[PDB]
Amino acid sequence: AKDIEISASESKFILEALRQNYRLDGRSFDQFRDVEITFGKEFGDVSVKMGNTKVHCRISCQIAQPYEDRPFEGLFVISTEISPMAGSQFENGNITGEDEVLCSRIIEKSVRRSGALDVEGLCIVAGSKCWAVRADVHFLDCDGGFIDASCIAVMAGLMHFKKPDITVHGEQIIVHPVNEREPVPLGILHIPICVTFSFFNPQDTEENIKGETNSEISIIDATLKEELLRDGVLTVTLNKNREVVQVSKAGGLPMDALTLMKCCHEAYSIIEKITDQILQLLKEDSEKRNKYAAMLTSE
Amino acid sequence: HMSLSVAEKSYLYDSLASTPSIRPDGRLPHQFRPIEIFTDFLPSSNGSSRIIASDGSECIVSIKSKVVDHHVENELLQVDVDIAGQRDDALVVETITSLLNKVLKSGSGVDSSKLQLTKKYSFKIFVDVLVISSHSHPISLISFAIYSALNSTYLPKLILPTFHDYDMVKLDINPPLVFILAVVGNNMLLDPAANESEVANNGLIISWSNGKITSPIRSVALNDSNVKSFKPHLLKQGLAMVEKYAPDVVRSLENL
Amino acid sequence: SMSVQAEIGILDHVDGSSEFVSQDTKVICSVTGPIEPKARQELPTQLALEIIVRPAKGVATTREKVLEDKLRAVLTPLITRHCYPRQLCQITCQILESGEDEAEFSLRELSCCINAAFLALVDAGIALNSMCASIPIAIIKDTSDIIVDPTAEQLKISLSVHTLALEFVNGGKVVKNVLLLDSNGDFNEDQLFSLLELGEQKCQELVTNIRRIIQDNISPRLVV
Amino acid sequence: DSMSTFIFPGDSFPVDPTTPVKLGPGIYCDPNTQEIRPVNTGVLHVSAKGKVQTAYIDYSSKRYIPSVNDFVIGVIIGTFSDSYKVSLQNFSSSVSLSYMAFPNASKKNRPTLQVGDLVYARVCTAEKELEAEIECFDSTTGRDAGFGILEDGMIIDVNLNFARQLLFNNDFPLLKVLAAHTKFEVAIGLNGKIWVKCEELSNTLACYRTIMECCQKNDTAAFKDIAKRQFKEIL
Amino acid sequence: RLEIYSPEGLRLDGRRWNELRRFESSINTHPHAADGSSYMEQGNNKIITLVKGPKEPRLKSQMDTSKALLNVSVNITKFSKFERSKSSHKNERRVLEIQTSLVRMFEKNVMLNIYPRTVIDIEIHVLEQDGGIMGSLINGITLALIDAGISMFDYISGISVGLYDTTPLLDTNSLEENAMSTVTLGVVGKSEKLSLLLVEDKIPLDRLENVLAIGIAGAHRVRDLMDEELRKHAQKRVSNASA
Amino acid sequence: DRRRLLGPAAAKPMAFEQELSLHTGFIENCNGSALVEARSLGHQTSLITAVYGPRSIRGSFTSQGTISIQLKNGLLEKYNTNELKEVSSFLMGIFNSVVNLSRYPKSGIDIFVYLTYDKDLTNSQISSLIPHCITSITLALADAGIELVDMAGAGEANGTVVSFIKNGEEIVGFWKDDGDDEDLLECLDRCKEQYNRYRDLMISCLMNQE
RNA sequence: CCCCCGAAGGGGGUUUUUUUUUUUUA
Ligand code: NA
Ligand code: NA
Ligand code: NA
């Protein structure tokens, strides 16, 4: 079973706290967690930390053959396989699970299908070769917000990643170690960022279905304790082009449309900050690398 | 139905094995149960059929087509069976699929020449079966639905091949029928009910085409509780019974 | 010469956790137990082990299955299993960085997996029979030298590769048993035993270092 | 003896051989070798004497293992014919709580506890072959022993060492620095569970936050400060 | 490229921006196969929905002492499209996402708590497909569940709205679903509250709200239709059963 | 595949009357086992069966034994999965007629037939292969100590496989799949002769061996 | 807690294809 046993006092406590405008970790309802993005070692290796939530992403690529249907496009896959490391409530590789399928689908719709990565820039030669870029997410610690953290990790990783320069002479290609030629980054078209809103019903279901004065509570980036007690969940992916990359309200507590719109806009307010943060941290990483090279060329 | 008590099984068997056999609904050994069929309801498909039985067993068949090189695809007719509540991996589903594929093999199941367009290209026929409900062996049900679907199947007309935009030619072919029989004691029964199939000593799958008893022919256990051996004269009885009571099923199905 | 980085109690929602880093090989491990096992895992008289190894790149394969197998071979006699009858210990290793050419070698990852698993088992509070330490060792093509803690480069030109996991007792001075020796490539008996002596010394060094690392962050948790 | 010493599994046990020693947690008597061997990493603890000294190893643990006379906080997760199914910790093996195991309880008069209720109980039976058993009464007399339902509070997950320190060590300042700010009810469960309830929700929340932050920090003297900053009611 | 929306305000099928496709429904179509059932046609979408239950759980696992278990099975037949799919869709992640979506939709609408220790199996067969299939699934489920006599708080109406440049188009077909981004809505009863909100392709934020506005309205109409059928089917089968 | 080493995906596969030997009880990790090898002119076959059971079953209490039959392709992937499962179903019917299932409530008997070798030098072979399957399964069931009301036998002629019990008086199996059109009686006679010979050989094997 | 008895006992929580570079410029 591996169920998380939640007591009545805890549910009532957290819900009543929400009624009195209180969150356990001391955040306001519209307050996203401080995102800590840390690069290391090779390009495409990134660690993302949201409060206690800890995820890790590893970008990699290898030469392959383009699919028969799509002759000019490269290959791109994302893996988000949970493990008992994040918590024992997770079974080892249940890809057919509700939240698993949902998470995977949200990330896929946010990054892989939105054209965030230039797939045609991955193609080496139309007929026989292409780049197979892979994004593998590793879930290290679960305190909620796995979708958002995953999206941030995948994007930051893709932007940080660099494939080795190559050139082509007909049948044959020539691939280079770092000493031969410098590596070149991937084609990032936009930066999709996900924000997850959690919905709580403070009153009874009757008030939600046939009651006026909507008391439905919404918070941003719920913790595990909050995620376990929520009645609804919405995930909205946006970019700095004011585009709704995707939206997923896969059932749950019925919410008024206007509230959902407000959620989308506030989410935009957050993804601005997050995007600027990602870009900044990236450039700082590159600069520190360059200065290290400068420290290496002369003792 | 299924999971009858030993008392019920004994009663039913005694009635079905007596001479003459007394069937639970008073049917004659060669009598079918009332069914009704609808066709041409799926516009996207080249053919379509729906068959409903009196016991609730319901099946849907779709006929689709695609141009193929004979040389690369020697099989011009493919049957895909999907039974609700049964995985595609299931033994009975693959058994029925194999069987149906053999009844309809372009080799001699049906006339392959009727499909030919050009010496290099032809129509491959995709027969998609969807068994919504079944309380007994659905092989005859499916077979009948497929018969109806094929007898009301229209294909694009030829004029690399190019085709007429609005006019279509009716696929002319004599589709085969598969019959299922219950062997109970010394009695042969056509269209076995679920309760009848629960106590049957054995079963006979008998194919039929152009007015002839054709292959495949199988012996099939309608259950696992009372599967017993049978004498050859019973097999002969079943064959004779089919070829005697098949042309009326054919004329009943082919009258539109 | 051989210096390692190691941390303890880094994960919140597990009983124990560790981070082990040697050269470029970086492995994080978690332990949950003793907890309730599912019926198919349950053992009447002893603790059952669920062991998982995840690769740095790609998705878990038969490679990681072999890694899990050897890790199990090491951790089974390590753990005092009869203290927890009909219970489960969940041990998961996430390889963050291989520090070696994944397609040809996996000894660095294995060694770091053993070290990290041991550390996490210590952090969890699970009864252990004794201490343990694992090192990777290579023998090079031309020099025919024995390199302890070989780099990926040294591995590329290696003639043989080796995983040495030893079991230690009495302050890390006595070798109780050899938990694992995984030797692959071309080698002879003399080379083997030289490799074993040097390997034992270096592993003892590692045991000492690990003891210090453990006490450094476990001692403040406890009361005088 | 009186001097506590750090110890690893496999290390040589340093107590007096001729002196009889009752063995607590951390120390294992091998069934085959009959050797006394440490199996836990931590601090070795030898009590003075009496009649025999206790040798035990205090080690950092997060996972509770039921032992008799322990005060635990469980949650009702199931109802049976003659007992409750109780959880002392998520993912752990459940514990049984007899229907008879209550004050003024008979077959006609049953306890009124539902699934999801907090129960404060005593581990009465912890056999290594059987499911653990808890109780909400004095097993001897059959009357109330300060056990029973915990209503409308907040529960706090905490490591075993912190909880044991909270229940047994009176020089521990957390309860004192909490009492300095508000009135509160507290139930301490050696299974790593702390129940807290104040009259006002705000104060209970403050208690929760400061207790958890105090749990994460090893330094004891910091507590007061933390409490201050936490009862200043920042967001 | 072609006139998806002509200056005259017409579409390829000849509809205007705010008009639903032909919507017809039938109830109790499979009385011998399920407790509740519905056959539904929306445009060219043809769907069979079967509700089995509430009934005894198959396993003595999957049994909940407090509420009923709700399962949804979506069968997208290989002949639903113009081109037959050689691959089954049953284990595709898209289909699993759809299934879990429908389940989590009707977990909050169906009073599962009054059917404890039971299982409600929903079996859906998409016979024909022509875009906007999600809303169709939703409607089919609502109809079939109501036919089963299974208690729920309200209707849930499913609809889709595409966004062509500045103008939104109601109830999109297959051709419109391509070369255009679409929003799927699951609206509760006559309320403004959304059970489902699905956006799978990029849409300008500033124009999203507008898309919802017509969508809700459309959904309301859909409700009025489903309702209109049920009552009739009720009125017919409550009068004939008399004497 | 995550559970197998299938190598590179870019790679593509390389394209370019009869004597009987019967033995039982040579496989040690199952209850019953049988080796059947057949040699006709320009045609040689050989297959093995293994009966694991009576074993426990997952699920509700069953009043009788539950038999499963699994055909495994040997060497060449010679046959279609659907046809293999069809033949499996056929054999299941036959040995549902033969095995004394009443003796084995809440119990499952799993039978595996490895089609190791099937090279006929002559230049739909399932039909000719079925009787040897039946022989091997009957032998392995008798070897496993699984109770049989009779010794299930079979014969093949003109694409017609017929499986008999009780000295050929009654039929437990009938398989007819194209293989030309001839009258039923002589196919019955030939298959019955094959059946009787196979029966004699099987009892003989069960008397020299068990 | 429901179930009998009478005035306490026994049982139960349900393991898609619409067809000449660059710059400023009336
Ligand atoms: Na509605
Ligand atoms: Na309208
Ligand atoms: Na059985």
Side-chain angles (χ1 to χ4, degrees), chain E residues 64-85 87-129:
Chain E
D64 193 319
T65 68
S66 62
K67 55 186 176 181
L69 214 75
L70 187 63
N71 298 100
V72 170
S73 166
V74 175
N75 176 32
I76 305 180
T77 59
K78 303 174 183 177
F79 54 86
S80 62
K81 300 240 186 180
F82 292 151
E83 204 75 0
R84 177 199 138 96
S85 57
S87 315
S88 179
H89 297 324
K90 293 189 175 302
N91 289 337
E92 295 181 2
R93 285 157 63 258
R94 261 167 185 155
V95 171
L96 295 188
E97 183 189 19
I98 292 174
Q99 288 180 174
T100 65
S101 291
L102 295 169
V103 169
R104 284 149 88 115
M105 276 183 63
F106 288 87
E107 276 174 353
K108 300 293 178 176
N109 193 31
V110 177
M111 304 183 178
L112 303 174
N113 64 290
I114 79 174
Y115 302 111
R117 302 165 200 254
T118 65
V119 171
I120 305 179
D121 283 327
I122 297 184
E123 216 178 273
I124 305 177
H125 302 278
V126 178
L127 299 190
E128 191 179 324
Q129 184 181 0

Side-chain angles (χ1 to χ4, degrees), chain A residues 168-171 173-179 181-188:
Chain A
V168 184
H169 290 155
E171 89 186 345
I173 67 106
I174 160 183
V175 49
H176 318 251
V178 53
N179 46 7
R181 325 225 207 118
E182 315 173 17
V184 290
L186 297 173
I188 277 73

